[PDB]
């Protein structure tokens, strides 16, 4: 659509195409996750439990909502995970 | 809607989705509270008496009003509580 | 409305919702006063003779006028009182 | 209107509401004077011959002109007087 | 059409005519590549495995999508390659 | 208009209202002169041959030109005179 | 027509009338070249191998395309040449 | 008509009425020239070889073309001359 | 009609009713002149040789033409004169 | 009719109903004057010699003309007076 | 225009009005020279061979160029001369 | 253009007009060289083999590159030569 | 581009043009090396095994990474080598 | 990203690229460790139990936390180890 | 957050991550205490009655307050205890 | 707020949190006093007549004023008392 | 305001709150005097003829002037008196 | 203004308020002289021929110049006189 | 300007106002000389061949150069002469 956002999975930040942003939190996390795995995956065998997205010093964004109505656009959010 | 705000519950700041901000103080405090509890709650058994929201050095915001007409948007307010 | 201001009653500064700011000095002082009392009042028995509002080093604002045409917005003014 | 200025009558500086600033020097000096007297007057019996307004090290502003076209806004000027 | 973008192949940045931007990632990479080769190629014998496009500190753009819906326009992206 | 400047006649600096600054050097010198005389004149009997305006260490400003195109605004210039 | 652009041939920049900009790269380079030569040519005997047009730090524009669909308008591009 | 432009002949800039701007470069240069001479000419005896019109840092405008299709309107161009 | 302009005669700027603006330069200068004299004239005995109208930094407008086709509307032009 | 304007008599600005604006300057000044007096008059005993209407920095409007053909509509003009 | 510079002729520094700065080195040197002579000349009989302009420790500025494109503005340059 | 730099040829430092700085090292060295020779040349008979430009303690700048992309602006570089 | 850095090869420090700094460690070391050799090479016959780059007392920079994301800009680093 | 830090492993201090610094203590210690080993390792056979990072006289930094929120950037910390 | 402080527990000083510093004295003392115990604890069996925090010669900080409003940041405070 | 000061009650100096410092002398003396008593009080039975605050050799600070306008911040003042 | 000074009345030095320092010498001497008397007065019956203020070895400050323009701030001056 | 100096008339040194220091030597000598006489004059009948001002061992300052450009500020100069 | 120096003509040292110090040696020697003669000259009839300026034990300063680039400022130099 016209929406897009930024997840920071560790050292690679992964640009997330977000289409319209009309979605609950979940599918994005999948998309990214897919992208993280599209960035450096050797064999697929790992974990993917990402805990939550943050603003720089800004707190935890609730992790279910319609992202586009909470979160705004073209933002860099980090992602706090285990996935090793 | 398009409104959103920031409550600082201690070490975690909790981003509050606020929708339109048309509400008296109370429901938000609930929402956050829910979010604080969605952030780290083990068993639910605790207290939740948050006393009041503040600006950095800025004073106490009256704790009942239509938030959006007093308080502006995309602000970080802290929250002074007992909840242990 | 869209207006708001800051009175500093001693150690607590009290954020004043001001609505539109179309008023003479008096009602605000009441509102705050109410808020000061909403902040820490035990039994109501005290005094409330606040003498005048100031800018940091800036002088005494005349204490009757239509606040919004003298005084501008989103300012911190202190309040010099007896109320003990 | 939207204009305002600052006269420093000795230890109290007196914030002057100036409305639009369209006036010769004189009425303001009255307004302030009124305000100085509204600040601390016991019985009215005193003098009020204020000699001239100054910038910090900046020289004497001619004391008749349309203030707003000479003098700019939201300035602190002092006032050099006898009024005892 | 009206769209265009910027790939940074090493020291030369290569302006990419993008026409309308309606395409998956691939043809562009070819176009540029062609342009890189149109910029300095001696004999054609080299490699061309460009790994991925980036924003300045911004992360990896997924490398297949309809560029124009992810990526916006008139941007400088770099390109991380081997082609020697 | 919106222009104004500062002449330093000895110990008093005399703020000069300059209106628009569209004038050759001469009328200003008169205005000030008038102001100097409006500042402290006893009987009018004196001299008024002011020689030239200066910047702090900055050299002599030619003493005829359209002030506003040479000289800029809200400047303190001194004045080197005999007028005793 | 309504289009025009700017080539920077060394110290003189040469404004290029571009008419409608509907052309491949070549004729313009001629026009300019003609203009460079119309700017300072003594006897015509020189070289004219201009290598390519650039944006300030922006990379090499492919040097054949319909300029107006790649390149936009009223731009300053430099030109990297030998022509001595 | 509705067109007009600005030539800067040295210290005086000379506003050029341009009528419709439908003309090759030459007549304008005459008009201005006439105006320069209408601005300060004592006896007519001088030179008038103006070399070319420029934009501020913008390069040499070819000096023959239909001005209005190259050059746009209500612009300040300078003029580089000998005419002494 | 619907046209009007602004002449700046020194400290007073004098708004000029211009009617339709269909006139050579001369009558306006008279009208204004009349207005300048309608603004502050004591006894009529003075001079009125106004030399030319200007834009702020913009050059000399030729001083005969049909004003409305050169000069546009609702402009402030100054006037450079002797009239003392 | 459909016309209306704004006179600024000192601190109160007085909105002037102007009907169609077809009138010489005079009756309006009366209307306003009437309105100024309708705004705050105690006993009628005062002066009413208003000198002239102005634009913000814009000069003196000739004080007789058919206002609506000079002056446009829905404007704030001030009024410079003695009336005390 | 808006440009101006500073020549230091010995003990007097002479502020140079520069208008637009569009000129080769020469006329300025004349202007100043005129100003130096306007500063202290008794009978005109002297020499005026000024050798070159300098920055404080900064080297010799070539003494012919379009000053404003080499030299920047509001600078103090000295002048090294014989003129006795 | 807007670029300029400083070469230090021995005791005279020679300010170099650099125009836009779009050039390889060579022409500048010529320009300066010309300027050095314009500074003190008696008969032209000498040598001009300048070896390389330096920063104060900063090392040798490669002596061919597009100066403006390596070297920044308004810098003092020295020049290490034989030219006697 | 806009990036540049400093390698200290022994007594000569060699300024390194770095373009954009988007590169792994290796090519730079080559560039410099080339520059060291462009600084003083007689016959090419020597060694070039530079071991690693350092900050003044600051430790060893890993010798492969994208320099610009580790190392910052306009820094002096030394180089510890054998090359004799 | 933009973050980086300094670990002092004994005599070599090892510059640590830190990327964004969003990590718990552990991975860094690995990175460095890798770098220490990339600095001088003969055969890999050794120990790597680094005990904790310090400021100069500043105490022990807790050895698990998100480094970037505790520890600031571009700091030299030492490392107290056995690894022989 | 961005806040941090330093407690000196005897010979080890223990860097305290403080997050935002919005807390009464107590939790910090716990955190540190935890850190002291994370620094050298064998079996947990000891005491932890720390009496109060000090500045070098600076007196006792009241031991309950919101630390960040009393105490400033990045300070070394010692701690006076029994804990053996 | 941001203000704080230091009272020296004998051997213990007692850091005084001062909040904003907007207060007459008295409440502070209480606060400290409270703190002195919070520092070492056994049974409360003692005296508390502190006579006055001093600078090192600096004289007696008047003991009523708005401390923050006399006294500056982050100062050590001693206190001269009987309280035994 | 922000100004303050130090008078040394004999063995007690008396810190003088000075507010803004805009005053002739006299009122201060009163203030201090009041403070001296607030420091140790038994019955009021004494003398108060203080002769003049001094710098350590620095001479007599004229004893009428606007203190703040002569005398600077936060100075210790002594006072030479009879007051017994 | 901000300038001041020190004359040493014999045993009393007399602090001289100097205002801005823009003056030839003479008026100061008067001011001081006035101050010397304001320090100890019985009947006025004496002499006042002060010969010249000195630095400690530093020589005679020419006794006419603009003091502030020769002499610096906040200096102690002595004065060598007859005045008995 | 801001420069000044010290010549020691025998027993009187003569402070030399030097203005900016931009001059060859000669004029200063004149100025001083003038000052020496302004210090003690009876009838003018004497000699003035001062041989050279020295530092205390420091050698002869070449006696022609631009003083300020050799010699520094606020120095005492002696002068070795015949002038009797």
Curated annotation (Swiss-Prot), chains A, B, C, D, E, F, G, H, I, J, K, L, M, N, O, P, Q, R, S:
Signal peptide: none annotated. It comes from the Eukaryota. It is found in: Cytoplasm; Endomembrane system; Cell junction; Cell junction, Tight junction. The modification Phosphoserine is found at residue 27. Isoform 1 is predominantly expressed in lung, glandular stomach, prostate, ovary and uterus. Isoform 1 is also expressed in brain, with a high expression in the cortex, hippocampus and in the striatum. Isoform 2 is predominantly expressed in intestinal epithelial cells, kidney and prostate. Acetylated. Deacetylated by SIRT2, thereby inhibiting Schwann cell peripheral myelination. Transmembrane segments: none annotated. Component of a complex whose core is composed of ARHGAP17, AMOT, PALS1, PATJ and PARD3/PAR3. Interacts (via PDZ 1 domain) with PARD6A, PARD6B and F11R/JAM1. Interacts with AURKA, AURKB and SIRT2. Interacts with PRKCI. Interacts with PRKCZ. Part of a complex with PARD6A or PARD6B, PRKCI or PRKCZ and CDC42 or RAC1. Interacts with LIMK2 and CDH5. Component of the Par polarity complex, composed of at least phosphorylated PRKCZ, PARD3 and TIAM1. Directly interacts with TIAM1 and TIAM2. Interacts with ECT2 and FBF1. Interacts (via PDZ 3 domain) with PTEN (via C-terminus). Belongs to the PAR3 family. Contains a conserved N-terminal oligomerization domain (NTD) that is involved in oligomerization and is essential for proper subapical membrane localization. Adapter protein involved in asymmetrical cell division and cell polarization processes. Seems to play a central role in the formation of epithelial tight junctions. Association with PARD6B may prevent the interaction of PARD3 with F11R/JAM1, thereby preventing tight junction assembly. The PARD6-PARD3 complex links GTP-bound Rho small GTPases to atypical protein kinase C proteins. Required for establishment of neuronal polarity and normal axon formation in cultured hippocampal neurons. Involved in Schwann cell peripheral myelination. Targets the phosphatase PTEN to cell junctions. This is Partitioning defective 3 homolog. It comes from Rattus norvegicus (Rat). The lineage of its organism: Eukaryota, Metazoa, Chordata, Craniata, Vertebrata.
């Amino acid at each position: 659509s016209e929406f897009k956002v930024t997840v920071c999975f560790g050292r690679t930040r992964v640009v997330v195409p977000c289409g319209d942003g009309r979605m609950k939190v979940f599918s994005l996390i999948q998309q990214a996750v897919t992208r993280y795995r599209k960035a450096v995956a050797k064999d697929p065998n790992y974990w993917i439990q990402v805990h939550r997205l943050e603003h720089g010093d800004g707190g935890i964004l609730d992790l279910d909502d319609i992202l586009c109505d909470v979160a705004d656009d073209k933002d860099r959010l980090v992602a706090v995970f285990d996935e090793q």
